């Protein structure tokens, strides 16, 4: 039986599928329990068993594969790998391995790997060939990601108001601003519907931390990619380990020539668990942020190009401001020069019950002619014009009014040039 | 003549007696018997490859022309046939 | 009767209980040893016994059966039970076992179980094929809570402002912004009264952390539901032992397709216990307060939800503020955005002797559209445009006599268009 | 008909017995002695089960099936018969 499908059989069904093998009081024990108990009963039978994840090198240099439905928690259902296998084959952390799995010996606590037939979706034989990721050479985003679905509905509008505002290329290094009751989940949705269903070839993963154990479960059902969060009840090791586990195994992928796109809510929290992890350097700034605590998040957040050759990485992470906190104000202070792409939520907008509530005059992109066309761009500037002298409140209302009416950006320019 | 990995059990194994420098009991697909010491796995072209010595044969051989081993100290382990 | 009646039995009731009887000696002071006596007076002739409590899983293998009533506190009448009945009928720690009592035998210093006959208030062999707590999927809160009691009176105030500031539903992840001076606790003790009297079904538990013997006793005599509480007196092991105890049992109820709801007063007693008796990692946040303590009260905290299949955990909290000790305020901001609602209390409002001191421009939940009808929601919608604008203060004022003059807020709401 | 779970002190008596290993006397309804040996306890669909192993026949009897059973160690224990 194929583990990756065990995981997503609900738990409920395990529970029949257990009990019909004749193994008993599985119901009050976690669900990779549960699997880790049904395997063993089926490897008893004989039969070849198929698993798959996502390669993490511990520091002893054994390593394990860990399912992204669980958002790569260590559990008794993760495979273990030899530090042979991972000399035999050259593998580094994020390698997605599927292969056949044996059970578990004497004095061995994990399933350990059989026979490696897939490496990054790939055969072994030609992944061990890819240049790293960190030998690729850089580049300005000239390919542009559209977010506008055209379909004139009340959602879409979000989308055309995202184009007019900022656009987004691949690789570009995203950066969304927001106060606390700005609606920043509803615009990270929509900004995954639109990936979804404009640009399907392109990989997507979404990656919450310090997210509410409810916020979660909705992200996983709207969300045709794949979601990995860590919910605000765990160490701030796991926030740390899930961050880590996300950006490898999207740096193998594009060493493949792959388009992967990362949605991170936020890295304001992401930054604020590196800073409990990382041991004190005794050079601590305001609001108790220590200085090598913030190097590991600008790794993360640097990762984000466009390679000169297949393939590229766009990283768009929000930031929080003005939430009462010094320490918020600190990581976002780090953080304010480094993104090629600056979207700004307003509040004020928000309290008016206007949606998106983007502040249209402090929100642009760098190289913008690289990604659209010059009639485009012309008319782009033209509507920053008049945008310009209003207001923040008074833009964002006119914009959505002259928006409504047309059911495309194309439209909405012809229109307004009469 | 396209290459065939081994296990990773079997590899391991092997691994194993090449650091441990054993005196395994070597018999090949036609049956050729032989007792080596095992140095070292080397992989050349995407071919994996096991140097093995006795009296200073030094001899090179492919891991899939190999069916089993045995050892005094480790039971004998057949290769999978895919 | 059972031990249960024979401990709360009042003084004189058990002296003629005693005699009529035919108990040997009546000059017994202590109820402990008359209790031993009439139970093995039963147990010898041949009747039989039964017990209840609430089982707590000890690391050494058995359990001892607590009794709610003395707050979980370890007691010689506390029953034991073998770690065999435990794997026999797969027990969790939290379970309430009621059923047949054995008297201690030689070397037995504690009764033992006999025969178990109800769990969870369920048959034994229904109640060990529940699905596991952790294994539920959270969903939002989408059912409400009412707390307007609808008879008029100047108690249903406070629950109808409250009502239109943040509705409560089951699942709810609420917290309470309190200064040490605010009237928190007459604000916790009509919720508590308006939840079983609008809602006797679902399960009402408060549980009370380092508190004044004298509020526990009038909180018991005015709360119906269970009421658990730990005293300033007993060391930061007893915080965190009783709080453990009662998060337990409420998944347990929870499994069972029952909703709970739990009063917390306070999040950052708890918090402190907890930081006082964890060890220290060598990393320490400011104000003393070592990283890794936190993680045990975010479990805590984060285990409130509403579950797909069936039942929900709520939990409403009260978090100190301003209290002189920068401890209560960085525990504080650690718990920011952990909560689906929020309800702010303003020091000044309480100087006027107005009543609740409820702050509304900083007050409401994440989500109103779930739990609210959408007439509802415009009217809100509308009261919230109106207070807005103005302060806070004069809004309280504003806000009492509004709702004085009118029966039921759904009065009101009509009354204020037009 | 209808299943009842045993006691507790009977429950752990039997497992402490079969944790001890050592042979027990069992006796049947025609009331023959045999000190047979019991391993565990399966159950099976909240079905309580026992295999008496000492005669090698391994049968699956219930836990109703047993009239009384007693120790030569310790002192005798009587199962509840209600």
Redesign the interface.
Known sequence: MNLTELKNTP??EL?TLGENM?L??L?????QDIIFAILKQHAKSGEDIFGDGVLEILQDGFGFLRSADSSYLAGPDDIYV?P??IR?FNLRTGDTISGKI?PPKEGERYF?????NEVNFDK??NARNKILFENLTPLHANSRLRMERGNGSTEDLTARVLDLASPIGRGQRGLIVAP?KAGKTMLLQNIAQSIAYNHPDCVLMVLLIDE???E???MQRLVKGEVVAS??????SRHVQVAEMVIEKAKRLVEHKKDVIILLDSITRLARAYN?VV??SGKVLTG?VDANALHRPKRFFGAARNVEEGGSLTIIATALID???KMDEVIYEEFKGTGNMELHLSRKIA?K?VFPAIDYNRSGTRKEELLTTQEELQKMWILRKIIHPMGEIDAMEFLINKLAMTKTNDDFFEMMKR | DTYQPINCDDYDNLELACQHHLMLTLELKDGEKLQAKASDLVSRKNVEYLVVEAAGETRELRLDKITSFSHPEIGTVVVSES
Chains 1, 3 share one sequence.
């Open positions: 738990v409920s529970i004749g008993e009081n119901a009050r024990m976690r669900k030899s042979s296998q035999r044996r350990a790997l059989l026979k490696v072994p034989e606390p509410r154990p409810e979660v479960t909705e919910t605000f009840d765990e160490p701030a409990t041991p004190a108790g939430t009462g906190s309290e019950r």
